[PDB]
Design a protein around this ligand. Structure first.
Ligand code: SF4
Ligand code: SF4
Ligand code: SF4
Ligand SMILES: [F-]
Ligand SMILES: [F-]
Ligand SMILES: [F-]
Ligand SMILES: [F-]
Ligand SMILES: [F-]
Ligand SMILES: [F-]
Ligand SMILES: [F-]
Ligand code: NA
Ligand code: NA
Ligand code: NA
Ligand code: NA
Ligand code: NA
Ligand code: NA
Lengths: 629, 630
């Protein structure tokens, strides 16, 4: 009865999937039928073998406490904590690999330093000397100091400069100032053990402390170091959606997250031997396509075409045109191994962090990265000989998209509206001014996943379209950004098409689209860098600005960690999918009310995007009045 | 027409008082839960993202076979198993992390001092720390820093104990499970269990084994060694156990939890003259300290403090109406205590910011002024004796004598009695190695683990231990299992004639030891590894070659899972008396109970009948003896 998507190409292939007789993520959601209301409310605990225990989400009725004595609030808050601990760890290991790659950069090696100016500037944040030193001794000293942020047991951690000092001392008084990344993950996992913490407030506060090691450390260093090694993103053109697949080219799709592999596949797709090889098997060339975050990472830096977002990964295989599906870690549906048994596609896993049964394991040798990517790519190009062009169905649907909007590039773009003799250059002042003046009502980040509980991409598009109509500039990352890209919002033409008067004027003056694709989900750290720069420039804290974050169709534990650190940093967050918290009323009051008194923001749970847009606008105008703007 | 709740007499008496007083127990809450969910009982339910919750069929080929993301039953089972190990590892991790921090803050005239210099000097040589002619506290700080790097170093290798055989290290390396930093492996396991990551049962379990190794050989190990350095290495010491140790006319302060620093500082505060006179002024005879669970073991091994009871007895202690102060830190403090303590004059005090409990009294243990903080907290217990009502008090006159303190150094010390002055070398484990190879001792078995309402409490412990020592298998015990043995009376030299077999009784008479050796808390299980490795190293073999076994007859916590996983990966067959949630994943069962043997030389055994378990252990040991030629 309900529509499965709002994207036509997504729907066309869904029909082919039914004809071919293959399962999709929608079909498995249906097979699940009415999902257990206990786990949907968070009032089930399995933290020890006395259980499984389930208490009633309706207070006063049914079973009240678990066998150990845990209340509903205790069970909910611990389950919520372990979600943050998981998402934190996901981004943690991500940035740890990126820092390790930076430690192994050499002058003549496969991994180099590409943005010397950024490294010199990042080195100043770690108190690493740069005057007259070799650029790789600097990079190694930066990597070492960044790695210390993951497991140091003595001393304090290094935090970015755009984090307002008001917020640091706020965290200190609240007792949520971050420690080492792995050290907090262990701390949350410790207190959630049976017979440890049994207080909702203290439990949530540990979760907020954990999430800070993600946004301002794990994800932040991951992004900063990814820019140093691969290049800081700048505005770039690309095409999005499943129509980027070419029938007469070798289609290699990069799925996953960790960017070192996809960065090396891009460089491997230009080796004359591998270029000549694709021609020898009968194709026109090598057509690199990205999906999800590793697709975002290479599109921001190299404009590689974005094949699609989370709930489309199954449908790319259904086209019958994917010769290689090269995946690393995070958000690779294990169903792909069974699905690709019905097609010539070679589904190749590469990271020992994410083995998948019945896939083809080709370990990405991080000690010979380029040679290793070539070996994996050659296997994909050879697989082109096994394509059956009669069963191929590539929908004729693709949209142009502009992305590459890093903080540096937004600042660079804003310099255009600065009078040579008046203001300062290379600052975020132009954006602060249009916010203070009121031409822009606010700025909203729209991030998040896809989720079968929501018509895929429908909540993203309605939220984004509604915010830009009310003169709220919108920045996007991850699968939401790729949902904007497919729809056609990442175009300068989208301003007069969909934006209100103020946003349309700023868009024309700055020469930008109304929706800024700021990269992958570790790249959300760019959003914090941006908002923090505006707060510092206006002498205020981040809870005082008219900013907001939205997760219209989230799913991953990464999103819970992301949403939790966005709030603790001081930014109101709207969720479009109810988290499993309804069972514990104290947990609800903490996340949706008391949070305000702690950090200056709170969570909002709204499944109607049009309602959420109202709330965001009203909350912004409320905060605007408090600030006098 | 129901099963008994316990085999302990004092436990049954107070349970009748709890019913009479109108309060609820952990047994009562178990009955309220009724039929627990078969899905979560089989481990075929996932909640690792909001696409779910999903539940797949535990019977393969029937029902819903895959979750929304495509995860099979084996994937879901294997990931849920991994997160148990990660949590159990994290608990012992932070336990030893905090202890190492105390070692870093030791000082000449401070509250925390170095007490076993000879242990500290020997540990420093294990961490490549110079000791010749250096101040003793410069050494302690260097050793602490080296131990803290084991938790979060990102480059280089980790420091491991010398009693770990190189054959086992080389085995782990080829298998791909050589441990990294403690907090790092915890994060790595949490990463791969995220949605859309690892989806292969073998790779997932192998990640669990690599993670658990950072507990037994690092987390728990460093915690135990550093606890001995600061508080003293345990030696043969007498004590009394069970709930009767409470004195009606004295101040009863009960220490519950795991972290030893608070319990240690309260012991030293219980001898402050100002507080003793206050105890007499409020109308009491003296300060009666009683411990529970690990923190009760930690102070009983070192100071002979009386042991109040094990895990499922903690509620019944408050039911006696004689607990004036209940001081708890972290790990295994049932949140029901906060509600139970409201029906009695007991003040339920939480002390650690790691484990706040609602509607309790929070007195944050100041580690910068430890003794003054312990003094301050103890005074609140003494003053609460004025609210005692002696008409309701019912302390069952039941308690048994017990011997403990059997650290590795003390066991080696006791083995010297049977060494000839001219023949063999002193201060080695050779006497224990010789009786095993000869066959006088058929094997060595470690009985550890929790309590669990699914088993008649302490019955699986006592039946397991009694059957083993009857079959000439010496039994070492830690944690609540040890306290089960202390309550029943197995921690006595008189227990040899009563229950031991011929060979074991002969070894007990010669060495002058009980047939059951209490080796401390559950981080003190590292002492058991340290012992077995010395025997493995002295016989030129690996640990999977020795006739050794581990048993957790009534386990419950995720700490036990991580414990049982590192015991197996170390090369010691482990029997489990409570079935873990793995029955829904047939590949996971094959990995844990068969394939594991071909990886690390040991495997899990799931058996709820302790008599059948003893049969399996004895037959298994004989196979490894015949394989080894002994
Ligand atoms: S922590 Fe408590 S409520 Fe949760 S499963 Fe364990 S015994 Fe039950
Ligand atoms: S969430 Fe709990 S009650 Fe629901 S199916 Fe899973 S184990 Fe059962
Ligand atoms: S990870 Fe898979 S099995 Fe688990 S809740 Fe998500 S879709 Fe379901
Ligand atoms: F095909
Ligand atoms: F790893
Ligand atoms: F159910
Ligand atoms: F493996
Ligand atoms: F009382
Ligand atoms: F000693
Ligand atoms: F074997
Ligand atoms: Na920066
Ligand atoms: Na195939
Ligand atoms: Na309020
Ligand atoms: Na030692
Ligand atoms: Na076999
Ligand atoms: Na059975």
């Amino acid at each position: 009865e309900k529509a499965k998507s709002i994207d036509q190409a997504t729907l066309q292939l869904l029909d082919k999937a039914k004809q071919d007789g293959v399962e999709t993520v929608w079909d498995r959601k249906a097979d699940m039928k009415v999902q257990c209301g206990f786990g949907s409310a968070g009032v089930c605990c399995r933290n020890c073998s006395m259980g499984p225990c389930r208490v009633s989400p309706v207070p006063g009725k049914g079973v009240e406490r678990g066998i150990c004595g845990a209340t509903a609030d205790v069970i909910v808050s611990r389950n919520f904590a372990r979600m943050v601990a998981a998402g934190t760890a996901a981004h943690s290991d991500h940035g740890r690999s990126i820092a390790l790659s930076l430690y192994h950069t050499s002058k003549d090696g496969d991994i180099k330093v590409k943005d010397e100016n950024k490294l010199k500037e990042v080195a100043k944040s770690f108190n690493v000397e740069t005057e007259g030193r070799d650029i790789y001794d600097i990079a190694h000293d930066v990597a070492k100091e960044g790695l210390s942020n993951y497991g140091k047991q003595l001393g304090e951690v290094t935090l970015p400069p755009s984090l307002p000092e008001k917020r640091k001392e706020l965290w200190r008084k609240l007792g949520v100032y971050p420690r080492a990344v792995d050290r907090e993950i262990a701390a949350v996992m410790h207190s959630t053990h049976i017979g440890c913490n049994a207080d909702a407030e203290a439990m949530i506060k540990m979760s907020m402390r954990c999430s800070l090691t993600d946004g301002w450390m794990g994800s932040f260093m991951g992004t900063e170091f990814s820019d140093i090694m691969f290049g800081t993103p700048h505005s770039i053109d690309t095409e999005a959606n499943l129509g980027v697949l070419e029938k007469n080219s070798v289609n290699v799709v990069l799925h996953g997250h960790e960017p070192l592999l996809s960065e090396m596949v891009v460089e491997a797709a230009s080796d004359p031997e591998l270029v000549e090889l694709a021609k020898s098997v009968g194709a026109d060339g090598i057509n690199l396509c990205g999906m999800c975050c590793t697709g975002n990472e290479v599109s921001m830096r190299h404009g590689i075409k974005i094949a699609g977002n989370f709930m489309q990964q199954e449908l790319a295989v259904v086209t019958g045109a994917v010769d290689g599906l090269i995946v690393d870690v995070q958000c690779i549906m294990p169903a792909l191994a069974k699905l690709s048994k019905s097609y010539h596609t070679k589904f190749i896993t590469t990271s020992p962090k994410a083995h998948i049964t019945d896939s083809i394991y080709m370990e990405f040798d991080e000690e010979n990265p380029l040679d290793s990517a070539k070996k994996i790519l050659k296997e994909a190009i050879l697989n082109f000989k096994n394509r059956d062009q009669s069963k191929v169905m590539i929908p004729e649907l693709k949209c142009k998209a502009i992305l590459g909007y890093s903080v540096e590039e937004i600042i660079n773009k804003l310099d255009k509206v600065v009078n040579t003799q008046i203001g300062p250059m290379q600052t975020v002042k132009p954006l602060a001014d249009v916010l203070v003046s009121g031409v822009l009502r606010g700025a909203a980040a729209v991030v998040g996943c896809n989720n079968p509980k929501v018509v895929q991409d429908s909540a993203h598009i309605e939220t984004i379209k509604g915010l830009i109509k009310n003169d709220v500039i919108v920045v996007v990352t991850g699968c939401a950004a790729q949902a904007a890209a497919k729809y056609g919002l990442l175009q300068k033409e989208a301003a007069e098409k969909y934006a209100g008067p103020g946003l349309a004027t700023v868009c024309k003056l700055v020469d930008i689209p109304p929706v800024l694709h700021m990269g992958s989900c570790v790249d959300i750290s760019r959003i914090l860098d941006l908002v923090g720069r505006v707060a510092n420039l206006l002498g205020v804290d981040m809870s005082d600005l008219p900013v907001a974050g939205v997760a219209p169709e989230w799913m991953s534990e990464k999103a819970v960690a992301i949403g939790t650190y966005v709030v603790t940093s001081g930014i109101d967050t709207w969720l479009g999918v109810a988290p499993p918290v309804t069972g514990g009323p104290e947990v609800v009051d903490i996340l949706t009310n008391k949070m305000e008194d702690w950090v200056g923001a709170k969570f909002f749970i709204e499944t109607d995007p049009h309602k959420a847009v109202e709330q965001i606008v009203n909350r912004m105008n409320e905060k605007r009045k408090k600030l006098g703007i």
